[PDB]
Symmetry: D2
Subunit: 149 residues, 4 copies
């Protein structure tokens, strides 16, 4: 059962949890958004071959946005974002409001969602995101991370 350093779960206790597992790099991430994040589904590298990760969708009519990254030369060095309660769909428990991804090759996949909430930032000085874990239900309640060197 090898393991991996898992960091956080930023977000809230609501929703059903999911854990995609660990895999060898990331190739594209897909997510929907409007005033908070909804659908989130990643395509990873599984030993050089793309592996479709499990899809965590929010039926909300939010806007879809694909994040293709030039792997293996480019990869994530930072993930930051906001957590806060969301009245429109009626839930007192925190949700991730906005997520912002940044890569080693200087590109920032600009703020997706509303930047309202309590700030979460995860800068990486050495190490690599190798998998995603978190809670979906109606939209993205929480998000955490698997890492490796």
């Amino acid at each position: 059962a090898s393991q991996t350093i898992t960091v956080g779960s930023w977000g809230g206790p609501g929703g059903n949890g999911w854990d995609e597992g660990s895999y060898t790099g990331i190739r594209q991430i897909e997510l929907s958004y409007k005033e908070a994040i909804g659908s989130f589904s990643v395509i990873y590298d599984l030993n050089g071959d793309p592996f479709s990760g499990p899809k965590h969708t929010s039926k909300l009519p939010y806007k879809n946005v694909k994040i293709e990254l030039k792997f293996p030369d480019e990869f994530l060095e930072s993930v930051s974002g906001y957590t806060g309660p969301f009245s429109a769909l009626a839930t007192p428990t925190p949700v991730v409001r906005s997520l912002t991804f940044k890569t080693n090759k200087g590109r920032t996949f600009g703020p997706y969602g509303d930047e309202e909430g309590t700030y979460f930032n995860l800068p990486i000085e050495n190490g690599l995101i190798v998998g995603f874990k978190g809670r979906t239900g109606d939209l993205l309640d929480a998000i955490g991370i698997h890492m490796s060197l």
Copy 2:
């Protein structure tokens, strides 16, 4: 030169940089504080024998606290805080303001320094801290963390 996952720099760019190195675990942490975090040094476990990490001392009149962990049974399962500039020490750049250590047993060495600034929260779910990195000048300008399994 084995390496170790290094996450974060939280804080700012001033002061001279230091990297304590990666080590087998953490036994004691010693800090000084009064409106922002100043002196920072730790004593780690170097293969079941206390090894004293380099002294990162501030010269300001700050209160002294000692954090003692019941190593091997007790390990940090968290690190949270506030980075914001300090107008009394006169720095335009963000410096680190509060440092609070939640633990695996259940203890929390409550907030040190003022809880005002942009928030930072590294909840560890699987993996251990094993070394510290940072930047100190007059106070503690930024802390960074080494992680391992």
Copy 3:
């Protein structure tokens, strides 16, 4: 490009180099043997799901064997075997002649292939074989290993 520890290449340099990569653990091994080990392919574990690894099949009319470990309570605790040339596949360079596997649950899957040439042995006290490296032309010319915690 997530990276793992890689050890070995116990064998010779002919055949075409293969590398199945690193997974979460090993669940079943299938191979064929008469005087040499011919076919070598494994059914790995991908995040609690079985993932059939790439097939490294050889045309020699060898007798095949399937080795079912009871992942995850059961995993490999040693890989040992013999490395030597083969006058019958009429070849001058080293070929992996035999291979015996021992699990942490005591079971040992007997030398397969005949025990001739120089002996290799890798006892593992703490760690996990997480994937396979290697060379297959007509027979398995070399075998190597990926390990992690």
Copy 4:
């Protein structure tokens, strides 16, 4: 208490057990040999500064050799040797007779000891020997390896 991949223990169960834990790299290795290996002590690298682990010496009037590696550019990419009982100093238990080291730089530190017995080979494609573990009484009974990335 972080953990590390430990591979091996080649030799017998004679002698009193020993473990040096793990560090950030290896700078120099010391040993006395003669028909067998006797004393084994090493200068470890601890976070940029030389660090000396436990001395493990044979009282035997064996000849002494200091292997001095050019750290961090040069490192061990392979270790191998011979383990077999000894009868002139009358121990019917497998003891380590020979030690040969290869470095990524192409320098091999010649078979020290008598090459009689069962051969062991640990060649390394990716990873770092990061500390030593083993048995010693009047001569080196066994030897194992700790590795990292």
